[PDB]
Amino acid sequence: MGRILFLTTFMSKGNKVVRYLESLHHEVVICQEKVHAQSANLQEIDWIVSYAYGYILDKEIVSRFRGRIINLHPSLLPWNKGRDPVFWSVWDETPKGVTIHLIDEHVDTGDILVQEEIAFADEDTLLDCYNKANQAIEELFIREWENIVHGRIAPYRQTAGGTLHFKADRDFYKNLNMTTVRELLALKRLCAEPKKPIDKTFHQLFEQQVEMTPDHVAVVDRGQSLTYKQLNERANQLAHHLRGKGVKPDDQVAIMLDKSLDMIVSILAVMKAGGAYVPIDPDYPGERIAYMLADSSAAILLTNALHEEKANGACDIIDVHDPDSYSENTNNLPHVNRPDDLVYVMYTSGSTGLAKGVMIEHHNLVNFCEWYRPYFGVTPADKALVYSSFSFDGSALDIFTHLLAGAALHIVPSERKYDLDALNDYCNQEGITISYLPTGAAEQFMQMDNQSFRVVITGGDVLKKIERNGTYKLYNGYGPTECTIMVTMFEVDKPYANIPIGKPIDRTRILILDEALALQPIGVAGELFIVGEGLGRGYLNRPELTAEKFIVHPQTGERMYRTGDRARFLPDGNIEFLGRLDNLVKIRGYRIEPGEIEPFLMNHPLIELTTVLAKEQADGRKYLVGYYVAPEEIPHGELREWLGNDLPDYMIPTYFVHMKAFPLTANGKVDRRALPDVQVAPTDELEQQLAQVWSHVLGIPQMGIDDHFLERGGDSIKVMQLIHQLKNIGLSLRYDQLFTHPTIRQLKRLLTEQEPLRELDEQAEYETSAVEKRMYIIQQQDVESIAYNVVYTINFPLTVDTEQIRVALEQLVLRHEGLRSTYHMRGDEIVKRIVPRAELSFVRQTGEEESVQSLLAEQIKPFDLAKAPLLRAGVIETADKKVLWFDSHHILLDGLSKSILARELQALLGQQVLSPVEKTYKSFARWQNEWFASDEYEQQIAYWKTLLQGELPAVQLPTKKRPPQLTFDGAIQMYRVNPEITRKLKATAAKHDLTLYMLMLTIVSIWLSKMNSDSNQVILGTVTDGRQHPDTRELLGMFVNTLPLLLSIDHEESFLHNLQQVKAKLLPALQNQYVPFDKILEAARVKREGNRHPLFDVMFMMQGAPETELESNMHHINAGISKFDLTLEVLERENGLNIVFEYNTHLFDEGMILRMVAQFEHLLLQAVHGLDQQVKRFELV
Ligand SMILES: Nc1nc(=O)c2c([nH]1)NC[C@@H](CNc1ccc(C(=O)N[C@@H](CCC(=O)O)C(=O)O)cc1)N2C=O
Ligand SMILES: Nc1ncnc2c1ncn2[C@@H]1O[C@H](COP(=O)(O)CP(=O)(O)OP(=O)(O)O)[C@@H](O)[C@H]1O
Ligand SMILES: *P(=O)(=O)O[C]C([C])([C])[C]([O])C(=O)[N][C][C]C(=O)[N][C][C][N]C(=O)[C]([N][C]=O)[C]([C])[C]
Ligand SMILES: CC(C)[C@H](N)C(=O)O
Ligand SMILES: [Mg+2]
């Protein structure tokens, strides 16, 4: 009876509730926009029911309707008041449920009417939880509404407590809506602050150690040594003098000495006096020494007579070999330091810009030392090497960690540092048990037969070798100078493709963030941020740069450091290093980390060291150069063949540079900036002309006469491009001929023997293509169907202007006649008309991440093929993103058209000008129709007549009972082939004259065979370009053609043999692909009858890598439709394969399809490793 005002996020929210209320003969007025106290909308309103309402109701509205305002909140109040209640119930691990409550003045604080608990399974994604809760609260309302209107329910006040969250409280977690409950909590453990500080300075701890082990050896240099007591006394003597010369807390004192007893005395003396030491290696270039002394505020300098002159008399010199530099007093100084005072300043390499002084405090170093000693179980019996230059923090590790453990430091002889055979002898002679070595030196030392080491720590660069002649444990540590030596540590227990850098040290946490500084899910790559007790004070005399790299996170408020390193968390907690963010480069349509090639090339027997770099040429294109250290230069073809075993062509360096040894740097890393630069051929006239075409199609500088097309990065798309370019020389080439003559040499002989698309004039009406007719006929049978609608979405940031998007789309309508085309019936002829302008249906909406799928499904509606434009668009704006969507009819937007539609939209959004389109779809339609009357068409159609005349193999799939009629209810599952496996698949195909499509098609056909008790033949469908004329490569319209592939599988033969046979049947099919599908059914004597599709129930489609980034961010949305029993679409994304399993829901449930996917994966893994294995040995289980 009463009139109900319904308030919601959008008009569509809580449709079940609105439907139940109306069934009871309530009048339901829906309002999603803000309501005011004095409003017309509160006219004859008896009840206000709000449900995800985005505005607060004024104090006047609540008092006027007191007792009549009901709200549906999907949380167990008082927990999780305000926005995103379901998300916070999971993240803050609160009681879970849903609540119907009265509305009062404040947010979610009114007395409760009904409350119910709810449980989210560990495997449910947050989107599942959002929907599961909403579903629960809506049902609860429908059950208790009767009790609510009649006022039977006794309201009970809320308990004090609970959390009120706001819109911006979620910003940090915006990327986590697709994770599971188990995954989300897992991320919380790693990336969240806990709920004992450091209260000591290093020399406090050192002095403590001396009283415990006074007579233990502390430092050894060749034959001379000092005990902990002796070292302590002498350092105190120098420290009394230094503090007498004015050294105050935070004061910098330069030290310029060679590794020696004097160096360790000098370091400790500067700490005891109260200052921080600035190490200046005397072997540095004079330019750098002067820079370090000048940029540093150090007034005092400790040095020798030897290196005295290198200071240019700039500082007050204190000679460590002058007796008057040492006081008589041997006692420890009165302590004047605090753990937050500087302990040392070290400078970054002056390569990438200028050298910066890194300021490290006492508590930074103490934290590392106290972690290190128990982590490695360092005892007073251990002996450590002082190997690193004392200008790098690898030295701080050598000296400070082991001095607080009572161990003995061993100055490495200069003459034995670079001679690892000699160093190994010194270590075996003196019993050296643990030390740190930079990665470069570490990898070389692994060849030495060592018996003394117990632990070897390495770091600084990517570890690429672990095989070693020694019984010692190998550790991989990672960290920037800006965070004290190391922040993560990993024990190398077994081989890895990418040796992890491990887990954080004490009082340290690592975060993986995106560019917006928001958390990444576990297993997703982002920028590595460091938090905790390791972060130094900042950069000396560069406070702007310090605030830029030592950021205070805008949401968490914690101080973190931007490392610039790309990294990723593994499921086991270990971190994985993925290179520098700057080293990502696009090579011929693929975004790659060149460092991922090095382990493959290094595995070569004659190659010891490798580094691959990206270099630019005049064109602006990038190319790869693989440098290697080998005894002798290895021929280019041998290295290309070696890598071709595992990598596609685009990941094989175009040039290889041999070198005796790589130029290192003082820290001990390979010097990337110092690597040198780069220093049968066609002889015939036609051969040169062909090489120029190949070099442009494949994006390659020089093409060999015998180079195989597929070996050098060729695929079917570029096969078509090749035929296009050749006709720009008057040379006609057929698709099948490119695969029977895949080299320039074989193509020469074929072309020694042997028409633009003419735009049509203005006409009232134009012919249609064969494919356009079919689409129009299908749509006319079920007039309001949507099985042939195409829907995409693009997640845009909130900064993107909603108007520019709309304007870009409306510009595309003017540009492409297809967007201004309509289809009408003229007698018994389907005919096309073109309008000069057409209004674009564009919609703006505000929704929620949980609701986007629902909001969008409402927009998807049938098209009137006679009304233009045949495309709609809209933007659904959620809290953290703007979701652009557009729904088009398939008669206009095929697969390649989507790539074009994406390329231009990205350019229009980037403020770039597009030259007008040359040709129109009209002209191709007429050209193709008139071509049907030629001899070549009669040839093609004859191939299918003879192929499909005999008995056809009927593939049976393992389905539930088939519906009696053709059904189209569908769902989707997705299987991801990681980059490593995809890289192997592509290499295998090219190595054996196969495209990736050909290989995947064979795995699929075998898969269908195994499910048919190992049948000899299988029949499946596929899709082809349809771009018959070369001048249609940039047009919008439907060209794709559907082809039946009749394949044979010989289970007695090898996988390789079947690949070749499938290739043999595919090429003739593609040779005659330009026959309309309706004519192929007519030629096979088959009609669309029964509950099975004409020729095949399984469809296999494939799409190459995206041409542009905007296309990568396009996501094809499925509105629960399956045109066939089962469709497999392989899409190349993120250097991997996303294989979509679109399936009929009446034939499969989620269970069956998930087991079929697992079987398919298992079959794929066997097939890629089992090239010569007989196909019958492959098993699904
Ligand atoms: N008086 C009242 N009590 C309620 O419990 C209640 C309402 N009104 N109206 C609807 C809904 C609460 N919905 C919302 C939606 C958005 C914000 C909002 O704008 N939050 C801002 C900060 C709010 C402020 O400015 O103080 C934010 O940034 O999150 C608040 C409440 N609700 C029961 O479900
Ligand atoms: N165990 C490890 N594995 C892989 N890379 C590592 C690593 N340890 C360090 N690195 C790399 O080397 C960086 C740390 O080196 P640092 O000693 O801090 C000076 P740098 O950054 O190499 O050059 P710079 O002197 O111009 O600052 C890291 O940011 C990372 O890129
Ligand atoms: P070659 O590498 O051996 O490739 C052989 C092919 C696959 C036959 C090649 O010649 C080819 O034609 N590739 C393009 C085929 C194609 O268009 N795949 C995607 C088709 N998908 C759609 O049309 C969808 N609409 C928009 O995307 C829809 C029908 C699902
Ligand atoms: C120990 C230290 C030298 C660390 N490996 C670094 O990369 O700086
Ligand atoms: Mg650096």
CATH number, domain containing residue 381: 3.40.50.12780
CATH of the domain at 672: 3.30.300.30
Measured by CA distance, the residue closest to atom 28 of ligand 2 is: 480
Residue 116 tokens, joined = 């119910």
**Region of residue 943 (phi > 0: left; psi between -120 and 50: alpha; otherwise: beta):** alpha
Other Cβ atoms within 10 Å of 974 Cβ, number = 12
CA–CA separation, 38 vs 1076, rounded Å? 65
Instruction: From 392, 400, 489, give the residue whose CB has the most ligand 4 atoms within 8 Å, as the site to mutate.
Output: 392
Domain shared by 740 and 812, yes or no: no
Instruction: From 284, 292, 466, 481, give the residue whose CB has the most ligand 2 atoms within 8 Å, as the site to mutate.
Output: 481
Instruction: From 478, 499, 611, give the residue whose CB has the most ligand 2 atoms within 8 Å, as the site to mutate.
Output: 478
Cβ of residue 534 lying under 6 Å from some atom of ligand 2: no
* Torsion over CA: 252, 253, 255, 261 (sign): negative
Instruction: From 466, 577, 596, give the residue whose CB has the most ligand 2 atoms within 8 Å, as the site to mutate.
Output: 577
Which amino acid makes up residue 939?
Q
- Residue located via tokens 């929210």: 13
For residue 501, the ligand closest to its alpha carbon is 2
Which amino acid makes up residue 603?
N
CA–CA separation, 463 vs 701, rounded Å? 33
Domain shared by 690 and 674, yes or no: no
Which of 657, 678, 699 is the last residue in one of the domains? 678
Measured by CA distance, the residue closest to atom 4 of ligand 2 is: 462
Measured by CA distance, the residue closest to atom 21 of ligand 3 is: 895
Measured by CA distance, the residue closest to atom 23 of ligand 2 is: 349
Q: Is 372 helix (H, G, I), strand (E, B) or coil?
A: helix
Pocket of ligand 4 (CB under 6 A): 392-394, 397, 459-460, 477, 479, 481, 485-486
Instruction: From 738, 790, 1102, 1112, give the residue whose CB has the most ligand 3 atoms within 8 Å, as the site to mutate.
Output: 1102
Residue 974 tokens, joined = 């997705």
* DSSP annotation of 1170: -
- Burial of 1148 (C-beta count, 10 Å sphere; 0-12/13-18/19+): buried
Domain shared by 745 and 852, yes or no: no
**Region of residue 462 (phi > 0: left; psi between -120 and 50: alpha; otherwise: beta):** beta
Domain shared by 294 and 329, yes or no: yes
Which of 471, 490, 508 is the last residue in one of the domains? 508
Domain shared by 731 and 781, yes or no: no
Domain assignment present for 763 = no
Contact 1, 25 (CB under 8 A): yes
CA–CA separation, 478 vs 488, rounded Å? 5
Contact 1150, 1144 (CB under 8 A): no
How far from the centroid of its chain's Cα atoms is residue 964's Cα?
45
Cβ of residue 919 lying under 6 Å from some atom of ligand 3: no
CA–CA separation, 863 vs 841, rounded Å? 12
Which amino acid makes up residue 284?
Y
Domain assignment present for 561 = no
Which of 924, 942, 972 is the last residue in one of the domains? 924
Pocket of ligand 1 (CB under 6 A): 50, 53-57, 62, 71, 73, 83, 103, 105-108, 166-168
Residue 741 tokens, joined = 């003559």
Domain containing 828 equals 770-924
**In degrees rounded to 5, what are phi and psi of residue 629?**
-105, 110
Domain assignment present for 302 = yes
Q: How far is the CA of 477 from the centre of ligand 4 (A)?
A: 7
* Torsion over CA: 931, 937, 941, 943 (sign): negative
Q: How far is the CA of 832 from the centre of ligand 2 (A)?
A: 63
Which amino acid makes up residue 583?
N
Domain shared by 403 and 459, yes or no: yes
CA–CA separation, 899 vs 1106, rounded Å? 7
**In degrees rounded to 5, what are phi and psi of residue 23?**
-60, -30
- Burial of 100 (C-beta count, 10 Å sphere; 0-12/13-18/19+): buried
Q: Which atom of ligand 3 is nearest to the CA of 890?
A: 25
Q: How far is the CA of 580 from the centre of ligand 4 (A)?
A: 15
Residues 6 or more apart from 827 whose CB is under 8 A from it?
Answer: none
Q: How far is the CA of 1108 from the centre of ligand 4 (A)?
A: 38
Cβ of residue 325 lying under 6 Å from some atom of ligand 3: no
Of 493, 467, 479, 473, give the one whose Cα is nearest residue 438: 479
Residue 524 tokens, joined = 């997703």
Domain assignment present for 535 = no
The experimental method, as deposited, was: X-ray
Domain shared by 1140 and 1073, yes or no: yes
Residues 6 or more apart from 866 whose CB is under 8 A from it?
Answer: 822, 823, 824
Of 901, 918, 952, give the one whose Cα is nearest residue 1110: 901
CA–CA separation, 95 vs 75, rounded Å? 8
Contact 487, 530 (CB under 8 A): yes
Domain shared by 184 and 278, yes or no: no
Q: Which atom of ligand 3 is nearest to the CA of 715?
A: 2
CATH of the domain at 834: 3.30.559.10
CATH of the domain at 1139: 3.30.559.30
Contact 1059, 1002 (CB under 8 A): yes
Cβ of residue 394 lying under 6 Å from some atom of ligand 2: no
Report the interhelical angle of 261-273 vs 202-212 (nearest 10°): 120
CA–CA separation, 1086 vs 952, rounded Å? 11
CA–CA separation, 864 vs 91, rounded Å? 47
CA–CA separation, 284 vs 11, rounded Å? 72
Q: How far is the CA of 567 from the centre of ligand 4 (A)?
A: 17
Ligand 5 is an ion; its neighbours by CB within 5 Å are 348
Q: Report DSSP letters for 317-346, one per residue.
A: EEETT-GGGS-S--SPPPP---TTSEEEEE
For residue 564, the ligand closest to its alpha carbon is 2
Q: Which atom of ligand 1 is nearest to the CA of 54?
A: 15
Q: How far is the CA of 533 from the centre of ligand 2 (A)?
A: 19
* Torsion over CA: 986, 989, 994, 998 (sign): negative
Domain shared by 718 and 818, yes or no: no
Domain shared by 1084 and 981, yes or no: yes
Domain shared by 745 and 817, yes or no: no
- Residue located via tokens 């099919």: 1069
Domain assignment present for 574 = no
Of 1091, 1074, 1066, 1053, give the one whose Cα is nearest residue 1171: 1053
Cβ of residue 6 lying under 6 Å from some atom of ligand 3: no
Measured by CA distance, the residue closest to atom 3 of ligand 1 is: 107
Q: Report DSSP letters for 1063-1123, one per residue.
A: HHHHHHHHHT--S-HHHHHHHHT--S-TTS-SS-SEEEEEE---SSHHHHTEEEE--SB-S
Domain shared by 596 and 657, yes or no: yes
Of 387, 407, 945, give the one whose Cα is nearest residue 667: 387
Cβ of residue 892 lying under 6 Å from some atom of ligand 3: no
What is the count of structural domains for the chain? 6
Q: String of b and e for 770-785 (b: at least 16 CB within 10 Å)?
A: bbbbbbbeebeeeeee
Contact 1038, 771 (CB under 8 A): yes
For residue 580, the ligand closest to its alpha carbon is 2
For residue 74, the ligand closest to its alpha carbon is 1
Q: Report DSSP letters for 914-947, one per residue.
A: -PPP---HHHHHHHHHHHTTSHHHHHHHHHHHHH
For residue 387, the ligand closest to its alpha carbon is 4
Domain assignment present for 1102 = yes
